[model samples]
Target chain A: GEPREEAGALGPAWDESQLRSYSFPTRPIPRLSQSDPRAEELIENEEPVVLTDTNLVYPALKWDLEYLQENIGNGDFSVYSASTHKFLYYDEKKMANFQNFKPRSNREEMKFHEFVEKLQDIQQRGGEERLYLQQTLNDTVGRKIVMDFLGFNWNWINKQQGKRGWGQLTSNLLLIGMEGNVTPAHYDEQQNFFAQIKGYKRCILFPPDQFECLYPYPVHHPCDRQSQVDFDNPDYERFPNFQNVVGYETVVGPGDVLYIPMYWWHHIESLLNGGITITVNFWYKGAPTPKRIEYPLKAHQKVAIMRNIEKMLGEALGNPQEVGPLLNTMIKGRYN
Target chain B: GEPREEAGALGPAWDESQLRSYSFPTRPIPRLSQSDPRAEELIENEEPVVLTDTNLVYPALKWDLEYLQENIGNGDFSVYSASTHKFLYYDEKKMANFQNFKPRSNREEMKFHEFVEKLQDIQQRGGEERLYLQQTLNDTVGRKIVMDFLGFNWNWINKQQGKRGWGQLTSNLLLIGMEGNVTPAHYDEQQNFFAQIKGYKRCILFPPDQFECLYPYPVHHPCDRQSQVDFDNPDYERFPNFQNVVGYETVVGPGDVLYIPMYWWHHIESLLNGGITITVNFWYKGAPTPKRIEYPLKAHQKVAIMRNIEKMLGEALGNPQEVGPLLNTMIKGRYN
Candidate 1:
């Protein structure tokens, strides 16, 4: 990892004190102005790049606690309760395999105001269980919030989607987090446009090709697509590749748009001392079903291939436990 | 595996009596005449097909013990002494890793006449160790033998290479094997034209995509590029995927040329009761360094990637044993 620039005589938006500590160091993600030609090139190359002054969500920049509490309506939002700072997303359907097991976090529906009140309390006075408001923007929100959403720079964003051959826009998520809230590392099947509207947060990204290093849970597991190796406390004995991980990190601030490529591993956190953070994200489906398979497959494509192989083997063997044994038998003495 | 067609009141070049028994069955390889459009199509598709009546090496069809002994000259040829029927090819350089390990076969230089004398003696009153004479067609052979080699159908063979963008011709190996001699399953890095000049040979081929099922040895091992699984005595517990293996098989006789695509696993044997077998193989390099990598990589390309990854991990870890541990740590509970 590269050394972070010191907080010199000139004040910066955020410093190292606000970021969480991790065992593995990460290199800095390159930043480019919205209009830089290289920005599009970087996006085309599927590399993460932070775009500053793009104003992709200029209307959302004014979205503070005051404005959001007053205008975002009484829509029911999904809020997660975690005993610790970490908020790990998982599939409830796959939890059946773990009998008598307890989940670390629980999800509940709450109104915007109620969620905000709890978040504010957690920020000012420490609490046992942390709260994070994660919701999808829909017609349930008020008119002013809708206006702000409509005011987003879709003309530029849509052009990017079309040019990149990305599929249709799925949904936009509005995330409001209390200081110190952490989102465990995981990858999505869709591309993302992460727009930071308030405060600052650090994001760490690893390319999909680093699949072996990340050690994602089995596709059928509740934590599927989520890395099993904890960045904060990596179990080197169980996950040695974690020690060889190389990633890119950057702290995004208000009006900064970070393009998170599809199938890329990402860990994000709301700055510890930077106050409440407000952000909106655009997630779109991947590029159109490729016309034909090309050589040197993209990292995401290989991820898809691995998933398909796992699913097929599971079906063929009829026992998920046998999967590891079979693969071990196939590669152990031979491929090694 | 499919049942072989019965000789039935009609005479065929060979029958089941000449073939050895194996636990697993195999499907037949498709056959087509040289002038058939599908013949070229199958070659382009990189599948094994027995091309009949091609006359690709018509001048060598007359090659037998009598003809070869008279024209192949008195040049020293490399003959292998095998204690058993199997003649496994191994790298001499990597043999140092095995202390007190004795090779099953030993290579020695002997004149063509001497090799024939010993080969004839074994055929009549079996000797303890079998002999196989394998040499490269070169200027060391007599003028008559060189003349026959030049008369090969290079126009057609060269056209196949050029159209497929294959690299330059490497060499043609002249192989003489006694009955019951087996070349255990292995893969080659170059395209092959296996032409049977005399007697009969049974060849079993598995596509390059079956890398896991075949369980190839490490790149640095003495048996590099060879399958660790013994087709005749597969250890199902150690290689579970071997039981699920599906492959193509065919018996090539005089005037039959079997195309063994590059990176394909093939196990060949000189039929038990078929007597001495003469074969001349044309091997050429792979397609010109691909102009650009395409998506959904070909099977051979994936093998190349896996090899590269193994080499990289071996170099990084500085120990070959660490390769298995790291890969197991990466894929065990996670990918499986």
Candidate 2:
């Protein structure tokens, strides 16, 4: 039973096509059926796909990871160990009660059997710390691993959040990545789902209107919405439209479930070197927009009106390099 | 029964906010219910929403223009007049069987009472020519218009092209636009739906991953996927990424239906001098992506892989501006 065909959980086995030149330019997110019409064209164009048969009988898709590493109890698991191999993101990786701000890629935390025995002794030696675990299953140490998240599909995800015009369901994040852990390239203001149960995790995406060819990181940073464009070393003269960006991948695994819309821009990873993956995700809350004179606007609502006219010109010139020389002194040549 | 909140079919009206600075930044093409979870997050993000209750009952949503000038019939439309106030697209806006090249400001062809008495004598005066019909409904005019395209929603659009694994349903354009017509910013290799039966038409979009900032229009142009940039006058140091383009608008009107998706880069227009505007559009044909390591791709499939790698670097440099200095000498710092 050890060998879900390829992509490991034990040592030896790492060819997911040598991460295929860290790919981009994808298209099969499609995995529909909650009445599918391409799952109602991802609610008529908030666009993202990969859901399937929502007679959706869930409940932690029948929990396992050996009942989440020995019958879920004694919670405590928030790990992160990467010793550099891409994760980078922290103006603060919090753990205070006495200051601490370590590790610089993606995330970290621990206990839960000491980050699952240092992610299995750093994948049985090939290491300098590469653990990743993520957790959010609550009541700590798995409250009976949430009677399998209290068997949710929550009346079919709150009837798919009161039929499309979305809003609630904001919280759920288990993740677990190992083998080849990474979570760098970022962009999530909300509206996601993720889901897979174990193994596989490629996900590459990039659509919030490629906010000027994915340079991101700078809304005062903590790697704000990530991507200072580095998908395996990419500077291209400071993101020269990162050689015209266009990625949109998918491979969640198990009963699969992707959809990560609102403010797109992802990177994810974990295709395994010694495998060990699991995800849950599920954040919602976004669907009450309009009255910016609604006339064809929505690339994350014009990225929230260019972060609302850059927070009204970073509050009328408190600086963001003086909101582009005051919007080029109020539109050069009066809006050309 | 003519009083559907403005856009006159007579007795002079004009006032769709004189085409409010041709907007962009829109949302709501959501007419859904394939079991909803935002039609399973638009079948997990192929992004382009705008569908609603497959109970899609129609009669051109109550067709009007006094039932196409009384009991529809005797076909003869095409219209287009625009002496320059916008409306520019041509592959011989269709006419004469061979060798015919002329006109360059929008649309032509008439006699439905000479294109409704010259779009009411060019909106009663301010004329420099400006009437735009653009048909294809059939039975030569009436036939109860194929009983209103046989209550369309062709099995809810081929069950949304067999649930976004798409293809088939390749034609359905009818458009009418008169008020302040314009269709410039173009793009369409397929997958559209437009709809809107009367008035409002301010689409504006632009997402095929902003292919080098909506530049398109080459391939021995007849305005291929249009966009040379002109949102009511914008030159920006000759489209220096037209100040990093950002238009995603929508305002179809009536029972609205937008979803254009598929190498997107639209512009569409018809408001302001508000008078005539009807549409049908439909299209559909993409949906066989994946394998190319699906990573954040789709900006019209990376403009068909940058026009198949610029026709294989224009056939290994037969000279098409030496495929941009041989792809900046095999990609600057030599492929990183």
Candidate 3:
């Protein structure tokens, strides 16, 4: 496969209509086809569709340096540096890095130059760090924009899941600028509407049925089949048939909403020098199940069973890990 | 209150009916009364009446030793023991306490004497200690007894609250003779139909409005106001208003069901000489609210909110106590 070139100028002059048109591929990627026989068969079977533009749900406006300028460098908005995997909150007495950084309450107060300078400093010292300084969408402007753009009722949407029936929307503003990297793919149980707000981010997704092929870690494990595979280096030897896995990918940009169906796997990454990419996600409980199927494959049932098993094991063994051992004792050789 | 004496003969000829008919004067325990001016004036009025002698939904004949001796117990059944607070399969190692207990594969093999002994043991121990073992009403006889006597359908009940329309019911056997005390007087969020099977139990109840009088310990505390006041020597000086408490008391025996209304306070105790008190609790959500009042005081709503706040605080502070201090800083004198 040949790498595509950047078509002149960093921030191209594309309008809303043009952006939506560009979102879906004019032609399918190589052997993959939108109307392929397999695709049709899978859809008929109610299987998940790995659409090409699923990463478009990342918010664009929130990724800009101006957004950070008005939000970051404050003691309250701590940065979790993934490079060393350490969380750094601004504490002057325990300073380890640069001292010139002044604590600012709002990111909007910084100039464009200061925002870029802070990003550079973070990138140089900490590699990839997540900034959680301010509310993702400033309550004043971003809140209305999110509600209107995402077609969600702001007052009804819950930042956390399951507590309220209002449904979940993104709470934090995210900006990812990567140098050709891969985030181990994993599926979030909740429904996700990922909108790409800024620079292009390529995403690959798989369905839950690939549970066996993907080899999710035991439920007891923390990293849970948040894949151990490093996309940069293929470990086909350890994960024998992993190379045989087929997936769909797409580069998403601003104002695009991609519905990543519930329990669908997604691997997302920022394109090289994607500069600063912003994204917002709106999650909901998909649609209600119709009353036709005699035996429904209810996600809620599985969740309940898991909860029961956890509770039983927690009570019996007085620990969580015992759940795995108990399951193994009951199922490993017997059920399979 | 004056101590009442048994009205009938001391032996088997003693009229068990008198045990139910005797009017135990209502102790001046803080109780919810619709007639109370303060409670009656409230927009939402709650008048919960405790009715005793409700027929057992499950027949005692099915749980009778002879029937169970022939078909229950042994390795075929899974019995949950309150002592370990865990379920034990028939095949598991028998605890030292069961050394003299005869091994019976079916209920028919059980002797009436043995059954009575077990019940006596449970009563002596109270509700918290001993092994409150009960067979899940999955089998034909067990199911019949559970459904008829307990007034609940386990299969149809909701193990997880609010998701599906179903509710939660917990059937726990009490071997109070083992000296187990009441676990705590904390009220369950659900409407409970607590039915006693083998022995006598005393229940103390209060209403939700008695929040100030009850003095519930901080939510984070282990003791939670699971009733800090000791019934024997309730420290009026420490818990100053303890003397002002007015509560209803009923000694529930076999075939007696006590309806513990939602949000109503209850403190249950097995009599000192009371044998094993087997109980099956039917828990259900309060019926849905009808559109009428501007604002309704729903017990479930408070329960849901408390759960949410506790969960959120637990997530943020990693402990429940921190939630108290944080809230204190945010709302202290403002509310009062």
Best by DockQ: 1
The per-residue C-alpha lDDT of model 1 at residue B86 equals 89
User: Where does model 1 exceed 4 Å of error?
Assistant: A1-336, B1-10, B97-101
Quantify how close model 3 is to the true structure by its C-alpha RMSD in Å. Answer: 19.0
Per-residue alpha-carbon lDDT of candidate 3 for residues A64-141, written as tens digits (9 for 90 to 100): 656545543332232322332111223344222223344432123343354466667777896554332223444334
Model 1: lDDT to the true structure:
0.82
The alpha-carbon RMSD values of the candidates against the true structure, listed in the order shown, are 12.1, 25.0, 19.0
The TM-scores of all predictions, comma-separated, are 0.58, 0.25, 0.36
lDDT of each: 0.82, 0.62, 0.44
Error of 3 at A99 (Å): 33
- Candidate 3 lDDT at B84 equals 33
For residues B80-192, write the lDDT of model 1, one tens digit per residue.
88888889687888786544446778998998888888877776685667878889887889989889988999998889889999998999889888888999999999999
Docking quality category of candidate 3 according to DockQ thresholds:
incorrect
List, for all models, the DockQ compared with the true complex.
0.11, 0.01, 0.01
Sorted on TM-score, best first, the list reads: 1, 3, 2
lDDT of 3 by residue, B220-250 (tens): 4443334555554556665655556666665
Interface RMSD of each: 8.7, 19.5, 23.8
**Among these predicted structures, which one has the highest TM-score?**
1
Q: What TM-score does candidate 2 reach?
A: 0.25
